[PDB]
Design an enzyme around this catalytic site. Structure first.
Site, PDB file in Angstrom:
ATOM      1  CD  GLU A  50      -2.874  -1.057   2.416  1.00 34.46           C
ATOM      2  OE1 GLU A  50      -2.613  -0.041   3.193  1.00 34.46           O
ATOM      3  OE2 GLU A  50      -3.895  -1.877   2.370  1.00 34.46           O
ATOM      4  CD  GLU A  92      -3.256  -6.179   3.896  1.00 35.52           C
ATOM      5  OE1 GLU A  92      -4.001  -5.232   4.565  1.00 35.52           O
ATOM      6  OE2 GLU A  92      -2.021  -5.964   4.178  1.00 35.52           O
TER       7      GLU A  92
HETATM    8  C1  LIG Z   1      -0.206  10.406  -2.466  1.00 38.73           C
HETATM    9  C2  LIG Z   1      -1.720  10.698  -1.982  1.00 38.73           C
HETATM   10  C3  LIG Z   1      -2.725   9.746  -2.822  1.00 38.73           C
HETATM   11  C4  LIG Z   1      -3.872   9.833  -1.650  1.00 38.73           C
HETATM   12  C5  LIG Z   1      -3.781   8.185  -1.298  1.00 38.73           C
HETATM   13  C6  LIG Z   1      -4.871   8.081  -0.241  1.00 38.73           C
HETATM   14  C7  LIG Z   1      -4.837   6.588   0.357  1.00 38.73           C
HETATM   15  C8  LIG Z   1      -6.174   6.156   1.215  1.00 38.73           C
HETATM   16  C9  LIG Z   1      -5.747   6.630   2.761  1.00 38.73           C
HETATM   17  C10 LIG Z   1      -6.485   6.009   3.614  1.00 38.73           C
HETATM   18  C11 LIG Z   1      -5.648   5.539   5.082  1.00 38.73           C
HETATM   19  C12 LIG Z   1      -6.330   4.526   5.890  1.00 38.73           C
HETATM   20  C13 LIG Z   1      -5.338   3.658   6.851  1.00 38.73           C
HETATM   21  C14 LIG Z   1      -5.856   2.631   7.711  1.00 38.73           C
HETATM   22  C15 LIG Z   1      -5.050   2.196   8.876  1.00 38.73           C
HETATM   23  C16 LIG Z   1      -4.471   0.959   8.519  1.00 38.73           C
HETATM   24  O1  LIG Z   1      -4.218   0.436   7.418  1.00 38.73           O
HETATM   25  O2  LIG Z   1      -4.442   0.212   9.694  1.00 38.73           O
HETATM   26  O1  LIG Z   2      -5.621  -1.671   9.130  1.00 45.00           O
HETATM   27  C1  LIG Z   2      -5.892  -3.328   8.846  1.00 45.00           C
HETATM   28  C2  LIG Z   2      -4.742  -3.461   7.838  1.00 45.00           C
HETATM   29  O2  LIG Z   2      -5.086  -2.533   6.779  1.00 45.00           O
HETATM   30  C3  LIG Z   2      -4.172  -2.391   5.607  1.00 45.00           C
HETATM   31  O3  LIG Z   2      -3.948  -0.939   5.387  1.00 45.00           O
HETATM   32  C4  LIG Z   2      -2.441  -2.509   6.003  1.00 45.00           C
HETATM   33  O4  LIG Z   2      -2.083  -3.269   4.832  1.00 45.00           O
HETATM   34  C5  LIG Z   2      -2.139  -3.715   7.218  1.00 45.00           C
HETATM   35  O5  LIG Z   2      -1.021  -3.558   7.553  1.00 45.00           O
HETATM   36  C6  LIG Z   2      -3.424  -3.135   8.373  1.00 45.00           C
HETATM   37  O6  LIG Z   2      -3.108  -4.056   9.388  1.00 45.00           O
END
Ligand SMILES: CCCCCCCCCCCCCCCC(=O)O
Ligand SMILES: OC[C@H]1O[C@@H](O)[C@H](O)[C@@H](O)[C@@H]1O
Ligand SMILES: CCCCCCCC/C=C\CCCCCCCC(=O)O
Ligand SMILES: CCCCCCCCCCCCCCCC(=O)O
Length: 466
Positions: free
Chosen positions: A165, A373
């Site tokens: 990601e 995922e």
């Molecule tokens: C470079 C700018 C482009 C914008 C990309 C945005 C991607 C989506 C952002 C949402 C983030 C959510 C994170 C969830 C937390 C987690 O993974 O545990």
């Molecule tokens: O938040 C749940 C999962 O979401 C995804 O954005 C990430 O790749 C994981 O590392 C994270 O644990």
């Protein structure tokens, strides 16, 4: 609902989230070691991944879980700082190599195919100190690490995710500064990191293609987080356009250069350039690829790896004040439909995955798709008989079946996040995504199946649903 014969049923983990052994056997620090040790309430209860699931010590326990599920594939990540304590091949941690070779060899002897992530949010601290994704030096550092991984493991590993990601990493680490190294750069840091992440990915793909593909015959992609997006008001043209633009900003920003033509989406370039000029910048906050870079980046993924959890509604929001930030560049706002259920940010919208898969098929020339995922958390603490959560999975599987059957999407692998309850980044152990429960208060870190684990094994055994 019978899935294709040979359909891949998997589960996923990430090194920092499960391994522990953060300084074991000469392992170098990664950015999460530094970050969690600093405390200051950035992570739930100042928790750390010092031990996590203890998978560095307890791989045999993970293998038991994998076998019980009957997975066809297993996704895990390699710890860069474990393998190369300073981030470079000047010093190799052989116990790191032995550890991952044992995972790979154990998987294969049990007929499970490894899907290996090189880099999953966990840069060696040495490399972050040298600029991380904000400096050009990272590109060669990453390419050299990738080659080392391909060389060491690629005789057995045939499916690779270079970067987990890159879109979430760019935003969380470098724009919002919610992840290490934990400094806000609103509207600036994200794009700069994105640019280097894209270049590094493309470089590693070319290294694979030129040096390893002929003999190893595998394939390489990068995984992208995707939130499906709908107009808040379906009858609003501005909301319709805003939802598509929001998809373009978060997903296509990365996928267009890599899968299509080596350059950013036009709407992304135009929006950021226009905002930047109004803000008094002599150049756009979105960096430009040279023509040679466009040529190098184009066509550097062998399949589409997507990570789906949730959906949002999108409303047009004019940046009247010329504020600085990514949402402002996109001129949107996001929010859920009040009717959707949720745990934290994971609103349960199973049909979102179907819309997403069709979007990928329509936009990226009907590619091979791996969902690397997908899953649902439970709040801690968290019933073993998780019948409610299992219903969310069942509904999601029905939507995957629809995508395959009605929309003829070439979905080949589905990967549940997670195998195990684990260190959920800033949520620490308070968010439990595992098919297996882990007791983090017990020094043996015992794994015990949730009901979802038993139900998932049944789906795998039948290759589908009733
Ligand atoms: C470079 C700018 C482009 C914008 C990309 C945005 C991607 C989506 C952002 C949402 C983030 C959510 C994170 C969830 C937390 C987690 O993974 O545990
Ligand atoms: O938040 C749940 C999962 O979401 C995804 O954005 C990430 O790749 C994981 O590392 C994270 O644990
Ligand atoms: C999980 C829901 C995320 C929805 C984002 C959809 C909008 C896409 C376009 C702009 C990207 C900006 C991302 C900002 C996310 C904030 C995340 C957070 O605070 O944890
Ligand atoms: C030597 C330092 C050079 C930096 C020059 C400043 C470049 C402009 C960036 C300023 C961003 C904030 C602009 C105000 C926002 C607005 O007017 O909408």
């Amino acid at each position: 609902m019978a899935f294709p014969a040979g359909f891949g049923w998997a589960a996923a983990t990430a090194a920092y989230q499960v391994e522990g052994g953060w300084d074991a056997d000469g392992k170098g620090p990664c950015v999460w070691d530094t970050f969690t040790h600093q405390g200051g309430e950035r992570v739930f209860k100042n928790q750390t991944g010092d031990v996590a699931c203890g998978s560095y010590t307890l791989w045999e326990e993970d293998l038991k879980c994998i076998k019980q599920l009957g997975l066809t594939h297993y996704r895990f990540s390699l710890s860069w700082s474990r393998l190369l304590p300073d981030g470079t091949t000047g010093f190799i941690n052989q116990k790191g190599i032995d550890y991952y070779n044992k995972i790979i060899d154990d998987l294969l002897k049990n007929g499970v195919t490894p899907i290996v992530t090189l880099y999953h949010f966990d840069l060696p601290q040495t490399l972050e100190d040298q600029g991380g994704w904000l400096s050009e030096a990272i590109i060669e550092s990453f390419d050299k690490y990738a080659q080392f991984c391909f060389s060491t493991f690629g005789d057995r590993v045939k499916q690779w995710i270079t970067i987990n990601e890159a879109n979430v990493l760019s935003v969380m680490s470098y724009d919002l500064g919610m992840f290490p190294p934990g400094i806000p750069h609103f509207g600036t840091g994200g794009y700069q990191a994105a640019h280097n992440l894209i270049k590094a990915h493309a470089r590693s793909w070319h290294s694979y293609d030129s040096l390893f593909r002929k003999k190893q015959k595998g394939m390489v992609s990068l995984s992208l987080f995707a939130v499906w997006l709908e107009p808040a008001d379906p009858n609003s043209v501005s909301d319709q356009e805003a939802a598509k633009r929001a998809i373009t900003f978060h997903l296509d920003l990365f996928a267009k250069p890599i899968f299509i033509d080596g350059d950013y989406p036009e709407v992304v370039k135009s929006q950021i350039a226009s905002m930047s000029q109004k803000q008094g910048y002599p150049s756009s906050r979105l960096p430009e690829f040279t023509e040679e870079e466009k040529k190098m980046i184009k066509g550097t993924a062998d399949f589409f790896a997507v990570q789906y959890y949730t959906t949002r509604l999108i409303k047009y929001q004019e940046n009247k004040k010329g504020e600085l930030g990514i949402l402002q560049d996109a001129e949107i706002e996001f929010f859920p439909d009040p009717s959707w259920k949720n745990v934290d940010w994971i609103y349960v919208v199973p049909w979102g995955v179907c819309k997403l898969l069709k979007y990928i098929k329509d936009t990226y020339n009907n590619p091979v798709i791996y969902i690397t995922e997908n899953g649902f958390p439970q709040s801690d603490p968290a019933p073993l008989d998780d019948t409610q959560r299992w219903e969310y999975f069942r509904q999601t599987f029905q939507e995957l079946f629809k995508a395959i059957q009605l929309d003829k999407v070439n979905l080949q692998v589905y990967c549940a996040w997670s195998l195990l309850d684990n260190f959920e980044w800033n949520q620490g152990y308070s968010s439990r995504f595992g098919l297996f429960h882990v007791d983090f208060e017990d020094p043996a870190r015992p794994r015990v199946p949730y009901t979802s684990a038993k139900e998932y094994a049944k789906i795998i055994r039948n290759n589908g649903l009733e």
